[PDB]
Amino acid sequence: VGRVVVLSGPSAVGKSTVVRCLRERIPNLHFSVSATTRAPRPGEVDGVDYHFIDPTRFQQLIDQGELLEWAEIHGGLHRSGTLAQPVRAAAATGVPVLIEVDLAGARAIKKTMPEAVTVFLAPPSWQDLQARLIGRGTETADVIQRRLDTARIELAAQGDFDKVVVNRRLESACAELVSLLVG
Ligand SMILES: [Cl-]
Numbered sequence: 001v002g003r004v005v006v007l008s009g010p011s012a013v014g015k016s017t018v019v020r021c022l023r024e025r026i027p028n029l030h031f032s033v034s035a036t037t038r039a040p041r042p043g044e045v046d047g048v049d050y051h052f053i054d055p056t057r058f059q060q061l062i063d064q065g066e067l068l069e070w071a072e073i074h075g076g077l078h079r080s081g082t083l084a085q086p087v088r089a090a091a092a093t094g095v096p097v098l099i100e101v102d103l104a105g106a107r108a109i110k111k112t113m114p115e116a117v118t119v120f121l122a123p124p125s126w127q128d129l130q131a132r133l134i135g136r137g138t139e140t141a142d143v144i145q146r147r148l149d150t151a152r153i154e155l156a157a158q159g160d161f162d163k164v165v166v167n168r169r170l171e172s173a174c175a176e177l178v179s180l181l182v183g
Pocket of ligand 1: 107110118160162
């Protein structure tokens, strides 16, 4: 049975650096393809970038417990979520699965799919995260303050996850996740 790993952590901890390392290192890694009710942008492929479905069909899927998690996007402009069945099929076939979601999405998946391993990508220190939130200093004080408070709140979620990987270094954070994904 394929392992299913749900990767999350703070907004702006550096998650997507790691994700692409994962996809190069594990050749058959199934990266979950979210369902969405928005329309395709040019170059997007149904089945690959998203599963493009209509709102009504998406509501059926909600109603029938077919989404491991879902959210309203941009205040309900449209919806996106993770379909259960492709993940379960991939795992039954023996292929590893990675699902990248925010913290609310990870919590919802732990209820709908308890055998999924939730992993929190933590910064190596508060100072490392803070330096990246401040960044080039292009944002206002009020926005930065909000970012810092958000980060401290997100960081307190980390104890609920099955595992924590500390993002001390790209190559090892990636390595720890490879070992998780292929046992
Ligand atoms: Cl969790």
